Amino acid sequence: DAPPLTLEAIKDRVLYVLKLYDKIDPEKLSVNSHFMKDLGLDSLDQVEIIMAMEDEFGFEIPDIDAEKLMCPQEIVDYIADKKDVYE
Amino acid sequence: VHIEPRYRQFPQLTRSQLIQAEFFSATMWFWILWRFWHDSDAVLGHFPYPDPSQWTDEELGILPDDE
Amino acid sequence: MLKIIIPTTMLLPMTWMSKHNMIWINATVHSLLISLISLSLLNQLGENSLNFSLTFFSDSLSAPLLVLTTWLLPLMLMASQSHLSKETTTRKKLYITMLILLQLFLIMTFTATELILFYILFEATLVPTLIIITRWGNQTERLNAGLYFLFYTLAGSLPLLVALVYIQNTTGSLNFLIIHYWSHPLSNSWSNIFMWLACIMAFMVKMPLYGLHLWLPKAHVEAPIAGSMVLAAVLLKLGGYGMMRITTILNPLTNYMAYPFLMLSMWGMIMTSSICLRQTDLKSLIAYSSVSHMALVIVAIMIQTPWSFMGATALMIAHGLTSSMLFCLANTNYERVHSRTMILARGLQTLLPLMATWWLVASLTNLALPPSINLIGELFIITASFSWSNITIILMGMNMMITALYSLYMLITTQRGKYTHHINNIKPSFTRENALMALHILPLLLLTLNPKMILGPLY
Amino acid sequence: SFPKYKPSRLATLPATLDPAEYDISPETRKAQAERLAIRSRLKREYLLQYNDPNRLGVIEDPALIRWTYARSANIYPNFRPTPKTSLLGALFGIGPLFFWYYVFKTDRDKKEKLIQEGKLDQTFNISY
Amino acid sequence: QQERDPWYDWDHPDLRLNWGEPIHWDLDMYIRNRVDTSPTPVSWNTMCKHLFGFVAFMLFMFWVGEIYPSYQPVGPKQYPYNDLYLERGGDPTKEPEPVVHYEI
Amino acid sequence: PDSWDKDVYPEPPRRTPAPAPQTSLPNPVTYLTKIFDLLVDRPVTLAREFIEQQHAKNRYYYYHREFRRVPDITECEEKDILCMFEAEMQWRRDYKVDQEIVNIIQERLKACQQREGESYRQNCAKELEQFTQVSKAFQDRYSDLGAHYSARKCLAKQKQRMLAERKAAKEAAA
Amino acid sequence: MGAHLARRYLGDASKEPDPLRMPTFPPDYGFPERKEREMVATQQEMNDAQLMLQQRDYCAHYLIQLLKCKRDSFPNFLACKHEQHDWDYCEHLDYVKRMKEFERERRLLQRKKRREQREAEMARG
Amino acid sequence: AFSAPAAYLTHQQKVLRLYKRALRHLESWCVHRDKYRYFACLMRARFDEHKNEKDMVKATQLLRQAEEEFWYGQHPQPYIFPESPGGTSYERYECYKVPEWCLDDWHPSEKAMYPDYFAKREQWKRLRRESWEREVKQLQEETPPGGPRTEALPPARKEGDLPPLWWHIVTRPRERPM
Amino acid sequence: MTLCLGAITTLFTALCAITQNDIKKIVAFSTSSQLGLMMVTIGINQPHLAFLHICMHAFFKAMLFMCSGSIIHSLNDEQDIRKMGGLYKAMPFTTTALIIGSLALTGMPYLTGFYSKDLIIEAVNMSYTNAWALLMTLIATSLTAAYSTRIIFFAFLGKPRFPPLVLINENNPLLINSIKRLLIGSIFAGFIISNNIPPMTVPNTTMPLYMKMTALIVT
Amino acid sequence: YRHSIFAVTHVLIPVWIIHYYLKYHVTAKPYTVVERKPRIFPGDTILETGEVIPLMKEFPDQH
Numbered sequence A: 001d002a003p004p005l006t007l008e009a010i011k012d013r014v015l016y017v018l019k020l021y022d023k024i025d026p027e028k029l030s031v032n033s034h035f036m037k038d039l040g041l042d043s044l045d046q047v048e049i050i051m052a053m054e055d056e057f058g059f060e061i062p063d064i065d066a067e068k069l070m071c072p073q074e075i076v077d078y079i080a081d082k083k084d085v086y087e
Numbered sequence B: 001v002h003i004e005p006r007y008r009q010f011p012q013l014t015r016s017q018l019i020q021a022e023f024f025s026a027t028m029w030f031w032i033l034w035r036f037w038h039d040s041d042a043v044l045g046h047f048p049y050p051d052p053s054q055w056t057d058e059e060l061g062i063l064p065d066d067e
Numbered sequence C: 001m002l003k004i005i006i007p008t009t010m011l012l013p014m015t016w017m018s019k020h021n022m023i024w025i026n027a028t029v030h031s032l033l034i035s036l037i038s039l040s041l042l043n044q045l046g047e048n049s050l051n052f053s054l055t056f057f058s059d060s061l062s063a064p065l066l067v068l069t070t071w072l073l074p075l076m077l078m079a080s081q082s083h084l085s086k087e088t089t090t091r092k093k094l095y096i097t098m099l100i101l102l103q104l105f106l107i108m109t110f111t112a113t114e115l116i117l118f119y120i121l122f123e124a125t126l127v128p129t130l131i132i133i134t135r136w137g138n139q140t141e142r143l144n145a146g147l148y149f150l151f152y153t154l155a156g157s158l159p160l161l162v163a164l165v166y167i168q169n170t171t172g173s174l175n176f177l178i179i180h181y182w183s184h185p186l187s188n189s190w191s192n193i194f195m196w197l198a199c200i201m202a203f204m205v206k207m208p209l210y211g212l213h214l215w216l217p218k219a220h221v222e223a224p225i226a227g228s229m230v231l232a233a234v235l236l237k238l239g240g241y242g243m244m245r246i247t248t249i250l251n252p253l254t255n256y257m258a259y260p261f262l263m264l265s266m267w268g269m270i271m272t273s274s275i276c277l278r279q280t281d282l283k284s285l286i287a288y289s290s291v292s293h294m295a296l297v298i299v300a301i302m303i304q305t306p307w308s309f310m311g312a313t314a315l316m317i318a319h320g321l322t323s324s325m326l327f328c329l330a331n332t333n334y335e336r337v338h339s340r341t342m343i344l345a346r347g348l349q350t351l352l353p354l355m356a357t358w359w360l361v362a363s364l365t366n367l368a369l370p371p372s373i374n375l376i377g378e379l380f381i382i383t384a385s386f387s388w389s390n391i392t393i394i395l396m397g398m399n400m401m402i403t404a405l406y407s408l409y410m411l412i413t414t415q416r417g418k419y420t421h422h423i424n425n426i427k428p429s430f431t432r433e434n435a436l437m438a439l440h441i442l443p444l445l446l447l448t449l450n451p452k453m454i455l456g457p458l459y
Numbered sequence D: 001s002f003p004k005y006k007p008s009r010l011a012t013l014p015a016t017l018d019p020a021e022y023d024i025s026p027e028t029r030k031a032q033a034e035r036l037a038i039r040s041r042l043k044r045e046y047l048l049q050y051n052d053p054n055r056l057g058v059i060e061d062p063a064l065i066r067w068t069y070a071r072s073a074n075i076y077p078n079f080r081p082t083p084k085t086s087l088l089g090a091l092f093g094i095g096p097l098f099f100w101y102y103v104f105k106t107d108r109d110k111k112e113k114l115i116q117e118g119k120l121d122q123t124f125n126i127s128y
Numbered sequence E: 001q002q003e004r005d006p007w008y009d010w011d012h013p014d015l016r017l018n019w020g021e022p023i024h025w026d027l028d029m030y031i032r033n034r035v036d037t038s039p040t041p042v043s044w045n046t047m048c049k050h051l052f053g054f055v056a057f058m059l060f061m062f063w064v065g066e067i068y069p070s071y072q073p074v075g076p077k078q079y080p081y082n083d084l085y086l087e088r089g090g091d092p093t094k095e096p097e098p099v100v101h102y103e104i
Numbered sequence F: 001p002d003s004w005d006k007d008v009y010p011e012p013p014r015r016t017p018a019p020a021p022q023t024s025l026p027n028p029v030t031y032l033t034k035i036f037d038l039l040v041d042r043p044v045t046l047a048r049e050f051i052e053q054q055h056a057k058n059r060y061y062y063y064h065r066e067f068r069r070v071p072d073i074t075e076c077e078e079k080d081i082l083c084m085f086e087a088e089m090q091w092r093r094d095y096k097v098d099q100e101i102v103n104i105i106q107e108r109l110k111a112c113q114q115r116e117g118e119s120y121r122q123n124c125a126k127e128l129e130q131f132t133q134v135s136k137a138f139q140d141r142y143s144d145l146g147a148h149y150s151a152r153k154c155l156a157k158q159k160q161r162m163l164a165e166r167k168a169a170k171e172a173a174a
Numbered sequence G: 001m002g003a004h005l006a007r008r009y010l011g012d013a014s015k016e017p018d019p020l021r022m023p024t025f026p027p028d029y030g031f032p033e034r035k036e037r038e039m040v041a042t043q044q045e046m047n048d049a050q051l052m053l054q055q056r057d058y059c060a061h062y063l064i065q066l067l068k069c070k071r072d073s074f075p076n077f078l079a080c081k082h083e084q085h086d087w088d089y090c091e092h093l094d095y096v097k098r099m100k101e102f103e104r105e106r107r108l109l110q111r112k113k114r115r116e117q118r119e120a121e122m123a124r125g
Numbered sequence H: 001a002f003s004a005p006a007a008y009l010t011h012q013q014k015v016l017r018l019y020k021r022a023l024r025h026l027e028s029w030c031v032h033r034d035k036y037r038y039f040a041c042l043m044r045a046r047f048d049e050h051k052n053e054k055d056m057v058k059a060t061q062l063l064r065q066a067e068e069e070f071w072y073g074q075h076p077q078p079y080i081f082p083e084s085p086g087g088t089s090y091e092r093y094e095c096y097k098v099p100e101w102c103l104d105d106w107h108p109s110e111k112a113m114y115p116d117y118f119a120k121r122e123q124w125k126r127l128r129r130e131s132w133e134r135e136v137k138q139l140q141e142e143t144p145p146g147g148p149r150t151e152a153l154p155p156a157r158k159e160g161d162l163p164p165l166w167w168h169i170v171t172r173p174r175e176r177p178m
Numbered sequence I: 001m002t003l004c005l006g007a008i009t010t011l012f013t014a015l016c017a018i019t020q021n022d023i024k025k026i027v028a029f030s031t032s033s034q035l036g037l038m039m040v041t042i043g044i045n046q047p048h049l050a051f052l053h054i055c056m057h058a059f060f061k062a063m064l065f066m067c068s069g070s071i072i073h074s075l076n077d078e079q080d081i082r083k084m085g086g087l088y089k090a091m092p093f094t095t096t097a098l099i100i101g102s103l104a105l106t107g108m109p110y111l112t113g114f115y116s117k118d119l120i121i122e123a124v125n126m127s128y129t130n131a132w133a134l135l136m137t138l139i140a141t142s143l144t145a146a147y148s149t150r151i152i153f154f155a156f157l158g159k160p161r162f163p164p165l166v167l168i169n170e171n172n173p174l175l176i177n178s179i180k181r182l183l184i185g186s187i188f189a190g191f192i193i194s195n196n197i198p199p200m201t202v203p204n205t206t207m208p209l210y211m212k213m214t215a216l217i218v219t
Numbered sequence J: 001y002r003h004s005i006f007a008v009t010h011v012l013i014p015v016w017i018i019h020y021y022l023k024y025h026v027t028a029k030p031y032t033v034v035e036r037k038p039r040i041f042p043g044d045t046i047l048e049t050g051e052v053i054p055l056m057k058e059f060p061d062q063h
């Protein structure tokens, strides 16, 4: 029914949401930017980012796995692995 | 017809579905108005409801209290 | 009846002289032919029975049971050939011989015209069943199950022998026709009470009656598949047939002596359905369902009205077929995973679709689903019990609700859900197993199509 | 403050409202570590058996075997006749029987009395 | 098993059981298809009180409305032939008590 | 139709009102009835005519079995097995015939109720009385014999009823 | 729904009429000469028309005429307005007759109460 | 789901889970987006107000009071994602998931209907069979003498090796198998 | 007993319906309330009005369920009105169909549901019934209007609340034609059926004006 | 063409078989098919005997 997801589409959507986040500078945001090491966020900000990604992609990420997603690339990989996207 | 998905944008609509929806809404309202024009007694009633207090004891067959 | 008895006594030498690889084929083919021949007994008269000779006779109650036995033999052959692949030739022939002897004794039991010959044959049916159970059972409890079965039946049935010889000495004959025409009322005395107790208690233990039934779970769980099929389909119907036969000479004492047995039957029907609700073993669930249905049959026989006898006969036939099919399905599941635990294997609907269909049909027939003969019998019994009293409807409704509950619980637990991950030895269903289920289920629907053939003499 | 929540047997206490969840002794931490170690050892054994490519069949579960054995075959050897068990068995086994006997006997006695007095409506009652 | 954690990687995800762990005695009735004991938003006593109060009040008000019925200020309806004596199955031989309805 | 007997299965004469249309609109029911007659009735009638022509070439007959009367249980001596057997068989045949009589009366009642429709409570009172009488007689005959009914049990019940009637008559005359 | 319910319940049920026991006075009490109601349709006509027993009231002839009109003009299901109106008017007249009966019962009951109160006062005095 | 759990949840993890749950239930209460943004900002203001506290006993007491307040004020019917455990679309496709061991029991004709797929399946089976011994050797080399203290598994330390216990994780059925 | 059972059923189900967030649940509770209304109709000795309401309810409730299914399928299996919004202009045809169905369900003066529910309410008010049952019937009608308004308001009015990837597409001929067929019935079928069936009950020609307008007032 | 093939088989054959079964088998035993007797109104013509059911009496007409 729904069009299949792709790695590029997932990456574009997550970077779109992150650039729409106010606390993140769009210019210095890359796919490998660490949320706390080089973006200057904290635990509550990471929780809000995970919730925003859940609202974006329409599925829930469990708290056990959500705490370990500290990178946009990690989020992309997690979403692709859960949605069985290989291209 | 093929409808492309939109991202954060209003979905693409079709003139056919637009005109069909408008036509059926207009049909419902025209039917309601046409029915109310002809037989409004189904809603507003058709016969007056009598007031029992205005009936005379003479016609109701009630004799005077003394009698 | 010799035209049916002799072909079985010829089945024996054929099996013992056949080749090592043709025993199953020969036995199945000739058992099917014998069943086809025995189908001719369903042409009964509306006035009296079919009196072939001084020794054997056939009635509207005996004919469906004979047809059921003759049709049941090849199905037992199929299941046995399923589970006895590695057995030696002599032991396979011994197993087939035990099955053939059991069928022969059952046929003679149903056709016997005297109560004493009936007793001798229906006691002779113990030996082949005991040997089958205690010899080809899988687990350790087969010995204990055999002991329980044997001693329950014998402790029930010896006073029946004493009462039968006493009745013959008193009246002159044990012939069923003579005791029917020359019947006299049974006065209310202690001696008559104890004679009634002897006869009824023997057949109640055979039924089984609630409180006298533990041998049934013990034997049915621990018996091989053929033993489980014959025990539930036919061997439970000997008690009902006997009670329907002997109650001619027990009136009017049955009016006063039936209360404890009716209360036991109804309450135990409720209790055994509740037990089925909480069973961790599939075979035990089927066994207790059998107990509940036979308790309903006991209630019908005890209330003893023309509408109750027809319902009793129809329910006996339907329960035989349904229980046999359920035992076969459970045996296929067991042979897949080598365990009888209900929750061990799941997702069998997404792993084996046609078997899921067979399970659905068997469970639908197990509960009273119209217009099945199960429902016909249950509804006739319920109507007769309602005419008897107006709280029996409450008890029957409770039983029907719990029956549907546990049947669908079994179906959902076994078939629905997600498959067990670590069970990867579930091969596709065999043509033999599918044919076994089809030959179990089609006769039931055909009997639904033509229901007057299983409603007994009272029709 | 806010109304308290009273746990029952059919509505248990949530973990976040359990008073013992916020008072953690150092022994509680080592107990949790031991529980996790047991779970991890069992999981490792199961996963080895599960992922073995040469395995065909069912991984027999000793816990399931113990449960099935304890539910059915282990009840009688551990049963002793006590006052509690005796009273409960007598009640649950005999009380319903005599209750139903009294109910049915009373109903049938009333019906038979009506029949004998000839004031029971039995017209059209052909089937029985 | 409903109370058990749904996000854990159980060996049997539907039953929510692990291989080798001890099994509860009443596992047969505590499966996700049967009796659920998970915490509720409202306390059990409060739920019982509210439900019982609602049903009892409804029954009481039904009894009250039965002893105080609602009707219209009209007389009984009138039928021509002795309140339709023959049409309701009356015996033709027996003569019914006459029922006469007048004008008003 | 001549398949059954009009006396055994009465039907009141059928009065169908004549059509009196009051509009110029065509009748869809009439049009569909004509279409149905053209498409179905004629083919089925032709097929039945062919089948009945085939049947008339091989016309053969079957008969109704006749049973003579035999001495009954009242005449049978005590423990005379042959006479008891004959009487029991005759009694069973009579029981079957009585059951079929009750069935016929019930069919009459059902048909009359359906035919009268909205006026069944008044126009079916004639068939209700016949059914009441037949049911009363059948109940007095075979009301509580039981599953093992017999001519002896029916005779004992009749003797009990006769004794009760005699006692009631004597009490009334006293 | 109505004021009569309030008067009967939160008031004097003795003075208010009883719907289940009405009438409680002789039909000629207060009426010198009272005419019996006239029935147009006969029992045989109603039976042949197969009117439901709830529809065999004094307005049955209009119902029979309406049914005959509907049957004849079948495809045109809008050509029975006059017959429908006649049947509705007859039912309305029957309903107002019942209302007059109710009102007469009520005022007769209150007149009886007044008379008995006057008699009690006279007995006291 | 994919991450091995720990023996316990730390205070930070507990408060973060409470924060996420409270935000979800607040979004359930506040249906509209602007209202939800307002009240979520207020909730994060509360969390930031109590963010800096050196007394762990007081922090635990505040956490307990917050949990009780949440339980009193939770939504009786909170929003659940369709694929989440409480959702309306949860476990809908579990009946369509068939395993590869079930796949290999096919008839030769059925296998011949898909010639190219089964060659790659045979390659995968050979790859699985050629690594099990190395996997078990690695697992038994790195475990403590007492036994596994956690459910985490080691990766492939060598160039030619595969991570131990990988077959079912890799070959699990797709989320929409049919 | 039937009257009391129907009254309590319709009241309780409507009261539960007015505050549900699952659209299928709301429609199911509306169905239960209509069944309670039918049971009330049987209890006041009006069997034929019950059958008429059965037919009308079949029509418009089937249409409502089809529209709800279309909404659910367009939003990727989302059944929460808290996540629906903007569908008034996002999906024109399902919007107009649901509006017509809700108008018929609540008893619009000349739709399919008018010829049954209005007569049922009139017969309930004009009969010798339980006062509490009559009151509960009226309250149930009001709550029916309430939950229909809730569905419309939380599903079609306002700003979008669904995930940003807009997959909304209702241009399938099968869906359009099925909703079209069930939409004509929700408008005209009641009139035809009411005007074709023979008179099988005595009409309530005379009644007070406020009692005549009770259904519209409470709605 | 597909609709025509569907119509002849699926509709024509069953109606033929059922009409044959009803006309010559079901309506060969008494009381198998019972029709509610047609309603007779005043001023009607019974077609069985050419009978004239008369009109009702004069209505006490109002307005």
Ligand SMILES: *P(=O)(O)OCC(C)(C)[C@H](O)C(=O)NCCC(=O)NCCSC(=O)CCCCCCCCCCCCC
Pocket: A042, A043, A044, H011, H012, H013, H015, H016, H022, H025, H026, H029, H046, H047, H050, H051, H052, H053, H059, H060, H062, H063, H066, H067, H069, H070, H073, H074, H075
């Ligand atoms: P990151 O590692 O930066 O996380 C910072 C944390 C929180 C870990 C801190 O380092 C920390 O531990 N600080 C001290 C502990 C602490 O923060 N204690 C207080 C936290 S709980 C509290 O104060 C907030 C609760 C208030 C809101 C409760 C919500 C209940 C209402 C919900 C109703 C449901 C519908 C709205």
